[PDB]
RNA sequence: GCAGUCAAGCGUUCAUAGCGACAUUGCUUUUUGAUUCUUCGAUGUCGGCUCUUCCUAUCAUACCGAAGCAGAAUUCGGUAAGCGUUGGAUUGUUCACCCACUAAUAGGGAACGUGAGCUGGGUUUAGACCGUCGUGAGACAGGUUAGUUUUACCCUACUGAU
RNA sequence: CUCUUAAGGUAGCCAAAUGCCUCGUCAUCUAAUUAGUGACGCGCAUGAAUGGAUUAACGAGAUUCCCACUGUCCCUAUCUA
């Protein structure tokens, strides 16, 4: 509801001292507002975001230097990362606005679900573009003033830059901790493209009982390891798991109702690392915090595919 | 040594030193216990400490129910395989070494001890006597 | 179909439990053995704090490694387990760090309960001595 | 490094039940440094393992005394070296750091005890790789990996035996 | 726009046999890890036939863990030439 920091005006005059003072102070008011929001929702669930001055200053600089932004969000969960106060924040100059949001990494959605997603992306009147980087569309092509390329990391937003120009301007990584200190691109010299650093937006749901271990948290640096384990367990059923991996895991050894069918990942990580041979220091046990990393970095790549439905609670959109 | 123990035990032959992985006898969810130390053990240079029947040890779960492992917890040795002498003359030994997870007061964590339990262990703790079906 | 056995009144379930919720709230503690106020040093020039044996960690104010250095401060938080030590806002000038901690302590028998408790971290002023001897003209290498 | 000397203050107005200023007297070789006195026709060079003995500047045990010592638990001090002072993870490590038991895991010395006692992980020849430096041969107190550890039968000492 | 007489470390890779600080930071394995692995990178002092990255098979090469096994050890004893 209230998730963005807001910089009202520049006023063009002078005095960089108070131009820095009013921006620092202004930024701090947003932090106090967020703490008040935190008392409200139980006591525990905090939205994922950042609250330092400089990387928000680097967006506060570029929003009016572009005066139009375009978005790069992933197609496997595009409902959550459409932050409410960013299409509302390209509104405040009373000029050409309405950002025309784009969703990328959309190769993974087939014909029976791209149209079902376009139904949601049209019906509630949200700006939308489908691209594997108004109803008459299947997917736009690589053929089809400053542009603000805005995206939270590991969405392939630096692989989008290596697919429209061929210049190799910014450095992508596997971990999402690289993009910072923006780099503008000159191409088709009457038009300019600017860059934005990696800015995750505050989303008020699913933060500690989360689903956000797909694009946000460090997979190589985690210390809960059972949340994403059961998250990988409950979707992508056992037959597709053994189809991809080839390993024999289970035929319901424990017959009690704690597991039943669709097995949880305390007999999955041990069944993966008993085949990969990863053992502990002292006893021969398959270490689940070693198997969990190779499960998570294989799932979030796109090998173990999963996409949620359009935001109505459905049964199953993917069919393996 | 007297950490919730009832009385004083005779010197049973020291069956299993530190590093011994004995079985787990109760239904706590553990399956084996890795002995790291024995409570009330004397210090001699190079003599690594050993646990007899009925001793309270500090141990670590090495297999089963991941709520239980990666932490140090007290156990009580209820079966040993080293043959020891009872003062009424009989020598005896079990077929496996096996212990039971307890709190520092001596109260158990499980609810039933599968398999036999030595008399010298069942007598020294009134909670191991309450949860054991077969005694010797 | 039981009774609390500490206060006596409430009937509680057979899911595996202990005396009443107010009784475990007021009588039973699992957060004992921690200091609720803690001091840490700093330098106003290089902005470097430390645990008093060790090297400066080169983090800044409102960071992530503040959780690491406060966990590495000797409290009872390491052995009582840990989850969700997320940060709480404080005025920058007021020179305090406020962390909420949630441990899952073990009760009288097998029952694990949640906890909400708080520890304030107050920062004192220093000068980073290893930096003060660098300005002092002792022997050179 | 430790011991005393005046002890601003702090310890709830409680100069000493404890701690802490300025400066101040002094000790031990158990360490940093300074010379170059002894060995350059060689005194085998780190650590660990093993084993014996000594010191007290006492960690525990014994007996006392004094406290914001009610009991319980602590603190500090006096005699006191008789008797003990561990098992492990990582590192060659001395050192350090955790884990755990314990009454306690005190500090040291005896050619920085101890290689014809051992080991050879480290260092310290010759082989080779990297990084930096040099035009180059080559250098590095930087990293890494391979690299022969000799003799007692003599005198004494000690252990036993005539 | 330039500054030295040319250019200004590209693709890659990493506390690597190359990282002084350094037992770097985070996670993980362990009861405990200056070790091992994964990840990060203004990298004293990585880097493209002074070859860079990856690699099945092979190795009396260096390194960490597990299973089995054991006098290596607890803690020594006995026997034979
Ligand atoms: Zn009650
Ligand atoms: Zn400083």
Curated annotation (Swiss-Prot), chain A:
Changing residue 72 to T: Impairs the nuclear export of 60S ribosomal subunit in cytoplasm. Keywords: Cytoplasm, GTP-binding, Hydrolase, Nucleotide-binding, Phosphoprotein, Protein transport, Transport. Residues 56-202 form the CP-type G domain. Disulfide bonds: none annotated. It is an enzyme of class 3 (hydrolase). Its main location: cytoplasm. The keyword RNA-binding does not apply. GTP binds at residues 104-107, 151-158, 195-198. It is found in: Cytoplasm. GO terms for biological process: protein transport; ribosomal large subunit assembly; ribosomal subunit export from nucleus. GO terms for cellular component: cytoplasm; cytosol; cytosolic large ribosomal subunit; mating projection tip. It comes from the Eukaryota. Associates with the 60S ribosomal subunit. Interacts with ARB1. GTPase required for the nuclear export of the 60S ribosomal subunit. Acts by mediating the release of NMD3 from the 60S ribosomal subunit after export into the cytoplasm. Present with 19400 molecules/cell in log phase SD medium. In contrast to other GTP-binding proteins, this family is characterized by a circular permutation of the GTPase motifs described by a G4-G1-G3 pattern. This is Large subunit GTPase 1.
UniProtKB/Swiss-Prot annotation, chain B:
It is found in: Cytoplasm. Disulfide bonds: none annotated. The keyword Nucleotide-binding does not apply. The modification N-acetylserine is found at residue 1. The modification N6,N6-dimethyllysine is found at residues 105, 109. Keywords: Acetylation, Cytoplasm, Methylation, Ribonucleoprotein, Ribosomal protein. It comes from the Eukaryota. The keyword Nucleus does not apply. GO terms for biological process: cytoplasmic translation. InterPro entries: Ribosomal_uL14 (IPR000218), Ribosomal_uL14_CS (IPR019972), Ribosomal_uL14_sf (IPR036853). SMART domains: Ribosomal_L14 (SM01374). One of its GO terms (cellular component) is cytosol. Methylated by RKM1 at 2 different sites, but it is unclear which are the 2 methylated residues among Lys-39, Lys-105 and/or Lys-109. One of its GO terms (molecular function) is structural constituent of ribosome. Its main location: cytoplasm. Belongs to the universal ribosomal protein uL14 family. Component of the large ribosomal subunit (LSU). Mature yeast ribosomes consist of a small (40S) and a large (60S) subunit. The 40S small subunit contains 1 molecule of ribosomal RNA (18S rRNA) and 33 different proteins (encoded by 57 genes). The large 60S subunit contains 3 rRNA molecules (25S, 5.8S and 5S rRNA) and 46 different proteins (encoded by 81 genes). There are 2 genes for uL14 in yeast. This is Large ribosomal subunit protein uL14A. It comes from Saccharomyces cerevisiae (strain ATCC 204508 / S288c).
Swiss-Prot record, chain C:
It comes from the Eukaryota. It is found in: Cytoplasm; Nucleus, Nucleoplasm. GO terms for molecular function: large ribosomal subunit rRNA binding; protein-macromolecule adaptor activity; ribosomal large subunit binding. GO terms for cellular component: cytoplasm; cytosol; nucleoplasm; nucleus. Keywords: Cytoplasm, Nucleus, Protein transport, Transport. GO terms for biological process: protein transport; ribosomal large subunit export from nucleus. Disulfide bonds: none annotated. Acts as an adapter for the XPO1/CRM1-mediated export of the 60S ribosomal subunit. Unlikely to play a significant role in nonsense-mediated mRNA decay (NMD). Present with 11900 molecules/cell in log phase SD medium. Belongs to the NMD3 family. Associates with the 60S ribosomal subunit. This is 60S ribosomal export protein NMD3. The gene is NMD3. The chain holds residues 16 to 156 of 518 of the full protein.
